[PDB]
Amino acid sequence: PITKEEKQKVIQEFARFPGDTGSTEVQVALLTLRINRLSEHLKVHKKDHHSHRGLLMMVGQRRRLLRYLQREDPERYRALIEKLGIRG
Amino acid sequence: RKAKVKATLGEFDLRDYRNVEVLKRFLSETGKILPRRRTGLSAKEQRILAKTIKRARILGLLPFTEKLVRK
Amino acid sequence: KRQVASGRAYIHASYNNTIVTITDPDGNPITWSSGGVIGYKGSRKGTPYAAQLAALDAAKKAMAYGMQSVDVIVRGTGAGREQAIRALQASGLQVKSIVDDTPVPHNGCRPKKKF
RNA sequence: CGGUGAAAUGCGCAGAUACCGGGAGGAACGCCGAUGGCGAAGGCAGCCACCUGGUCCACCCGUGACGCUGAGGCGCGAAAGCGUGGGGAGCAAACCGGAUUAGAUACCCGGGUAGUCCACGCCCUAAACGAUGCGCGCUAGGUCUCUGGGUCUCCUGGGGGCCGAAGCUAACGCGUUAAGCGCGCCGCCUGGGGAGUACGGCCGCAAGGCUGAAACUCAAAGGAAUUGACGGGGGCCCGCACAAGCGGUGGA
Numbered sequence A: 001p002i003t004k005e006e007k008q009k010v011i012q013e014f015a016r017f018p019g020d021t022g023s024t025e026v027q028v029a030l031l032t033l034r035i036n037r038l039s040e041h042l043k044v045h046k047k048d049h050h051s052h053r054g055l056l057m058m059v060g061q062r063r064r065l066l067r068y069l070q071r072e073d074p075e076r077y078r079a080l081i082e083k084l085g086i087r088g
Numbered sequence B: 001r002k003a004k005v006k007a008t009l010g011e012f013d014l015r016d017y018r019n020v021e022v023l024k025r026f027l028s029e030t031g032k033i034l035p036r037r038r039t040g041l042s043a044k045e046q047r048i049l050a051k052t053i054k055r056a057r058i059l060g061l062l063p064f065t066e067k068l069v070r071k
Numbered sequence C: 001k002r003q004v005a006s007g008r009a010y011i012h013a014s015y016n017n018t019i020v021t022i023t024d025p026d027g028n029p030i031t032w033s034s035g036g037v038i039g040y041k042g043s044r045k046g047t048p049y050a051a052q053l054a055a056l057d058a059a060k061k062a063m064a065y066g067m068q069s070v071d072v073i074v075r076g077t078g079a080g081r082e083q084a085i086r087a088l089q090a091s092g093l094q095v096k097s098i099v100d101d102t103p104v105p106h107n108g109c110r111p112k113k114k115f
Numbered sequence D: 001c002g003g004u005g006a007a008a009u010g011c012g013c014a015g016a017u018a019c020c021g022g023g024a025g026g027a028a029c030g031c032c033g034a035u036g037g038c039g040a041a042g043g044c045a046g047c048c049a050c051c052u053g054g055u056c057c058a059c060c061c062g063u064g065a066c067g068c069u070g071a072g073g074c075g076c077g078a079a080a081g082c083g084u085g086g087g088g089a090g091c092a093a094a095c096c097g098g099a100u101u102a103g104a105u106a107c108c109c110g111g112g113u114a115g116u117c118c119a120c121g122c123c124c125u126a127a128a129c130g131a132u133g134c135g136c137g138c139u140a141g142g143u144c145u146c147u148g149g150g151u152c153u154c155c156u157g158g159g160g161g162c163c164g165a166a167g168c169u170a171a172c173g174c175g176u177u178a179a180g181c182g183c184g185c186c187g188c189c190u191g192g193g194g195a196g197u198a199c200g201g202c203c204g205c206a207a208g209g210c211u212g213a214a215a216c217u218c219a220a221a222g223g224a225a226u227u228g229a230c231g232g233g234g235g236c237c238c239g240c241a242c243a244a245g246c247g248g249u250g251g252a
């Protein structure tokens, strides 16, 4: 899985200010995690079709948040993407 | 209400798959896991018990099946 | 030839026919009898009377091998399973025990069309 | 022995069935098991550990409208079925044999190949059904149940059922799990047969699938409900109706 300790260090990494338990950047971050983490599982388990379902949902969600941020503050969008290497 | 095995017992661990002397009492004259009707167990309890007995049988302690002796 | 003090009486009743074999306390059969051996042909073997016969002859042949007592094992649902017992019971053999050991699969082979 | 209404085919003196012990193999998991749970659907139950999705409750901490729907696209998709390879206990299309029957060429019985099982790639259909698209707000209650929280008599969330206010409905029924009152967005329908056919196009190794007519022809096709009649449907009751008798007709 992801242990609390692991995920917390992600949070603190992207946190827009001390204590931000969940801004946009943070949500994208934590979500980006869960995706790579799950995608990797799916390279091994190509038959877990059911879990793939949740992956589309996670992915699509990640897009809508970014989509929002692109419109909102296009700079924090560049930042957040580069700082995570996405859109490809 | 013939006899409820919830009452004839103190408190015990339902996840304890080694406590034969307890578990023994939730089976029939055959190895069969008693119905919740005779066990008096909760809805949640019975599912837990259910797994514990299965675990314990596989360990060799409780029987899968018996043979009915006309008593 | 041999002399068998106590023993086993196995009763296997079908819907079609009831067979009774008698064995030594190690389970090796001594004499047996069925409904057809009694001398019945078809439908008639699977009968509380045919079965009362099968049992009686089984213990008859048996007590000639010195048989005295028997533990009883019935396998099956069916007619005159009960008759086979009572026939044994009141045959002249002392009936130590009765048990049912009808094999119930724990869900294995798909059965024939008519189940 | 088996087997059926009865029975034969079959198996058995190369010793079967029944019984005890040993071994191999495949496939499915009794009891728990529920009228229960989970899943978007198809679907999912022995046990264990690993990897993994959805989801509910409390706290009311962070973001600050970031939301809903969705042509096409993309992925999932029971069973049967296709290709290659492995596997094969039980079962079992076709096929072989026994019976039944006016005839069976089916229903019953004994066999049995594909298949059913695993991997990989296809197929992509269904009474794929709640025959009920998704999301949100609003509109009495009662009761049963699975599952969270509380100051746990009871209160408060999320599921699953039954009964019902208002209302809706052609009715049957629905009724806070709406088929009620409303808004958003998608899909679909426009008389029956012809017909899921033809033609064309697309997909497919194939079997075939998706999309889909008209000419013609009928004057209906339909849904629900009512009375009746009938049922090799159920329930209770009656008549010399059967049964229990006594005596006859049928023969002269």
Ligand SMILES: [Mg+2]
Pocket: none
């Ligand atoms: Mg054996």
Ligand SMILES: [Mg+2]
Pocket: D025
């Ligand atoms: Mg083999």
Ligand SMILES: [Mg+2]
Pocket: none
């Ligand atoms: Mg559901």
Ligand SMILES: [Mg+2]
Pocket: none
């Ligand atoms: Mg279903």
Ligand SMILES: [Mg+2]
Pocket: D060
């Ligand atoms: Mg707050």
Ligand SMILES: [Mg+2]
Pocket: D064
């Ligand atoms: Mg702000």
Ligand SMILES: [Mg+2]
Pocket: none
């Ligand atoms: Mg603020």
Ligand SMILES: [Mg+2]
Pocket: none
């Ligand atoms: Mg959405």
Ligand SMILES: [Mg+2]
Pocket: D070
């Ligand atoms: Mg959508």
Ligand SMILES: [Mg+2]
Pocket: none
């Ligand atoms: Mg399929």
Ligand SMILES: [Mg+2]
Pocket: none
């Ligand atoms: Mg298949």
Ligand SMILES: [Mg+2]
Pocket: none
């Ligand atoms: Mg194949």
Ligand SMILES: [Mg+2]
Pocket: none
């Ligand atoms: Mg093959």
Ligand SMILES: [Mg+2]
Pocket: none
């Ligand atoms: Mg034939």
Ligand SMILES: [Mg+2]
Pocket: none
């Ligand atoms: Mg057959």
Ligand SMILES: [Mg+2]
Pocket: none
């Ligand atoms: Mg067969």
